[PDB]
Structures are given as C-alpha cells and as structure tokens.
Ligand binder design. Structure first.
Ligand SMILES: N#CCN(CCN)C(=O)c1cccs1
Lengths: 300, 237
C-alpha cells in the first residue's frame, strides 16, 4: 500500500482520490493520502474552494515512482512531483504517518468498484493520450480539448484520443456506403480493433479513461469520446460475444458510480436510447439496461 | 444550411447547384394477394435532379429490376438515389460539378453526405421549401420515358423549354413550380387548362405547350385559381 505525502495544504480545496473525496481547509495540517492500493492506476484531483472553476488532477501508478503533491503559489495549483531521493521520501512519509496527518484510502474490502472502473486502463496508454513525456504521471483538467475537438487550440495541452467519425472515409469503404454506415462492424473490427487498438483491451482502456475524465473533471471532449466508443460497438451487427459481455459489465459499473445529480450533463439521451432500444446490441446489455432503467428512467 | 424563402434568390446566382428529389424513386401499387394478404408491385421510377438556373434536368430512370431480391426498399431507395447522384457528379467535368446539392427531403442528407465524402467542398443542404417536384410524373413526356424504360437509363431534358430566351431564371422557376403545384393539386384540371385550346401545341423537342407571352399570363392565372379553388374545396372555405 503506497503513499502520496503533501508538503502542506495552503489553500482550501476539495481533494479527490479515485471515487472518494474530502474537504481540506486553508492551512489545515494535511500531509497526504496513505494505504493506496497497489495494482491499479489512480487519480488525485482538486477543486479549489474559492474558485470551483477548473477541476484538475493527476493520473499515476505508485509502482512507477514516488510521487508527492505541493502547492505552487505562482501558478496557483497543487502540483504532482516525483521524489528521486528514496530515503527522503521514506523519511517524509514515516514522519507524516507517525503524526497521523494523512487520510487513509478508504477502500471497503468487499468493494471492487475501482478495479471495475479501471480494469483495462494502463499508465502507459494514459501517457500516450496525455503527452508530457518528462513526467511519469499525467495532468488532466476540465478545459482540455481533444484532438478531434481541435480539428472542428494548443496541441501540447490536448487529449489525444483515437478519432472516431461515422461520416468519414476511414469509417466508410468505397462501394459499401449504405452497408458500412448502417452496420459499423467493418469500422469497429477491421479499422479500429485490428488496425488501431490491436485488441479489445486497449479499446476498453481508452473508453474507461474517457469516462473517468468526463466524470471527475467534467471534461466535455472526454464525454464525447466515451459515448462515441459505446455507439461504435452498439451500432455494429458483428461483435465478439466476449466484448459484448465485457462492455455490459464496464457500463454497469460506470452507471452505478455516476453521481445521480450529474446525469443531466454526463449522459447523452440520443446515444443511450439508441444503444439500449434501437441498435443491433439493444438486447446484449442486460445489466446496463437494468441499472439505467432503475436509476435514470427519465433519460429514457 | 437550410434553403428557405429568405435565401431564395441564391438559386439563380452563378454558383452551380442542383436540387435532388427522390419522391418518385421507389413507386409501388398496393394490392391484395390470392390469400387475402397485401403485397406491393414496384413500377419504374426516377431521380429528379434539376439545375434551377439553367433548367437542365438529369432524369435517372430507376428500373424495377434494381429492387429484385432486395429488402427494406424504402431505405435502399434513398441510398440508391445518393449512389446515382454521386455517379452523376463524378461523370461531370470539374467545371460543371455543383458547389451545392439541395435535397428536397431531409432523409436524403446522410445517404448523400456519405456517398459524397470524396467531395468535401460540395455542400449538401436541406430546404424548408415545400417544392412540388413529386408532380414531375404528371408531365406526359417524362412519365412516358420512365414507363417505357426496360433498363436503367439517364435522359437529359431542359424543364424550361425555351423560356430563358424571354424570361429570367427566377421567373422560369416560378412558372415551373406553379405548373407543378397545380398538377399536384388537381392533375386532371391542370392538364385541361394546358391542353384545352386545340391551336396550341407542344413542340417535339419541348415538354410544355408553345404559349405566347400573353397566353402564359392567362395560363398562370388559371393555374393560380385552380390551386386556390382546390384549397377552398379541401378546407371548406
Ligand atoms: N517526500 C518527499 C519529499 N518532500 C516534499 C513532500 N511531500 C519534502 O522533502 C518536504 C516535505 C515537507 C517539507 S520538505
């Protein structure tokens, strides 16, 4: 179980760690988060009290380095940094644990929520979507645009999700216009899976990462990508059975975890009604359909 | 975006544009089967592709053989329409290709956009106008060529005859849409109006009769009265 030490908390902030969150008062003696489960990526995120504008945060994997957080009063944010002096790290963590100045990652033993939301998410794939190669962790915020958004403005600050466009030459074979537009199996299986993602695990990892950025940062471009990757599968007549069953599980846990009062803004009515009730896969998502109808019947 | 009453004169500028109307592509008669069920029998149809500035009409005849063994024919008809318009554009020299294609029914937008992905600079647009191009099959010579076709065929016409020698495109299109609206509202009465005078004929190379300017004024007034008359009959006014 790993630890992210904080140097201090100088401005009042709501701090998230994965699906948990807590409030830190200005200059409260807060010195980090302990007992972080090894084996998964994590995200540590922030919303300032005096300006709830801009949610921002860092994706990281404690296996890849020793990371701490310190506030920068010039740039006005909590920054993740890597500690290359291991004995400094360990001594700083030990002191802060002895004084009981850290919150414990509050995972219940029965609870697989975080694993289910990140099953296919790997740090190496995150770092290709979020390009900043000098750091082992990745910054994301509410306002970052995607490569697709930018084509329709600073490239270095972009989310390089795989571009999906149903009315594009990539999605439509010359001479199969009607076929490929009404059944996206070609585009799913040949173009995206075999060609770009190489396998369904990488596809699901990007879908899962897109959802998490949408939920934790309100990142609109990420929400678009999440919905596009769902629609691409649902609008395909030919999808491997294992992918359909896995998608149903993925979406079930995403819908279960979504804050109820964010549904109006994080869920696209057209996509979900099409996917659940009209698409080729309308009868293949039993768990997701049941949770959606019991929890968001208005949307449908 | 959409083409409506406000931006109406754009039809007659010097940017090449085509209207595409697919309402006569898939045509059927509905009838009873021996067992007392209902079935359809297709008849030949056409794509109506019209340059409103010049009157050039590319009439692509849709022969019933294109439906043989196919399912979901109303959906296929839209895609076949888009496939044929795409093929027409590719067959035209670059300087004759349209800059815009205006579809009369919004269900044609996605099929046409998809078939035209190779032409990102050709705008595909809907219209808020209710244009009477479905009545094209009430023009005797057009209906005749469609029904006589034994295979797919394209036939070229000028839907304005020689009117542009004497009137502007705007006025020619107004005359065309008035005639077609009248044929759509009461085909028999409209044809009676056009053919009642034995001395006025249709040239071999024309679609409409050879009316003088004053005779066109009379005809146009008679068509307006027909349309109004039928409106009253319909709504009891
Ligand atoms: N670990 C480590 C390294 N690090 C920053 C913090 N978390 C520090 O050395 C100091 C912390 C607080 C005063 S110095």
């Amino acid at each position: 179980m790993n630890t992210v030490p904080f140097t201090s908390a100088p401005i009042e902030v709501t701090i998230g760690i994965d699906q948990y969150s807590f409030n830190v008062k200005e200059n409260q003696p807060f010195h980090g988060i302990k007992d972080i489960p090894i084996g998964h990526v994590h995200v540590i995120h922030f919303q300032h009290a005096d300006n709830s504008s801009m949610r921002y945060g860092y994706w990281f994997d404690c296996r890849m380095g020793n990371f701490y957080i310190q506030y920068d009063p010039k740039d006005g944010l909590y920054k993740m940094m890597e500690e290359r002096d291991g004995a400094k790290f360990e001594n700083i963590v030990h002191n802060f644990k002895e004084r009981q100045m850290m919150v414990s990652y509050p995972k219940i033993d029965e609870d697989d929520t975080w694993y289910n939301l990140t099953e296919f998410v790997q740090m190496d794939k995150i770092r290709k979507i979020v390009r900043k190669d000098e750091n082992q962790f990745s910054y994301v915020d509410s306002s970052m645009t995607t490569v697709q958004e930018n084509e329709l403005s600073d490239p270095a600050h972009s989310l390089n999700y795989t571009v999906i466009n149903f009315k594009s030459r990539e999605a439509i074979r010359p001479g199969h216009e009607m076929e490929d537009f009404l059944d996206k199996s070609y585009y799913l299986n040949t173009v995206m899976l075999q060609g770009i993602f190489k396998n369904s695990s990488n596809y699901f990892g990007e879908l899962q990462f897109a959802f998490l950025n949408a939920m934790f940062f309100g990142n609109y471009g990420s929400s678009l990508q999440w919905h596009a990757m769902i629609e691409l599968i649902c609008s395909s007549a030919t999808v491997p059975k294992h992918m359909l069953d896995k998608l149903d599980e993925i979406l079930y846990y995403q819908i279960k975890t979504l804050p109820e009062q964010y549904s109006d803004i994080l869920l696209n009515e057209r996509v979900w009604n099409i996917c659940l009730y009209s698409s080729f896969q309308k009868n293949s998502l039993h768990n997701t359909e049941k949770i959606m109808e019991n929890k968001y019947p208005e949307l449908l | 975006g959409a083409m409506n009453s406000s931006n109406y004169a754009e039809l007659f500028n010097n940017d090449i544009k085509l209207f595409v109307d697919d309402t006569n592509v898939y045509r059927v008669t509905v009838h009873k089967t021996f067992e007392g069920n209902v079935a359809t029998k297709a008849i030949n149809g056409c794509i109506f592709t019209l340059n409103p500035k010049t009157g050039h009409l590319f009439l692509k005849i849709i022969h019933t053989s294109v439906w043989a063994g196919q399912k979901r024919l109303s959906q296929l008809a839209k895609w076949k329409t888009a496939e044929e318009v795409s093929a027409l554009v590719r067959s035209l020299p670059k300087e004759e290709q349209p800059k815009q294609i205006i579809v009369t029914r919004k269900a044609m937008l996605d099929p046409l956009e998809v078939h035209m992905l190779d032409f990102p600079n050709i705008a595909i647009r809907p219209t808020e106008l209710r244009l009477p191009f479905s009545a094209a099959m009430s023009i005797d010579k057009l209906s005749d060529v469609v029904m006589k076709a034994t295979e797919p065929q394209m036939v070229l016409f000028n839907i304005y005859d020689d009117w542009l020698d004497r009137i502007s495109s705007y006025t020619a299109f107004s005359r065309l849409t008035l005639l077609l609206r009248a044929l759509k509202t009461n085909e028999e009465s409209a044809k009676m109006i056009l053919l009642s005078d034995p001395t006025i004929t249709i040239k071999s190379y024309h679609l409409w009769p050879s009316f003088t300017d004053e005779q066109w004024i009379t005809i146009e007034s008679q068509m307006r009265d027909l349309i109004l008359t039928e409106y009253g009959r319909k709504y009891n006014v």
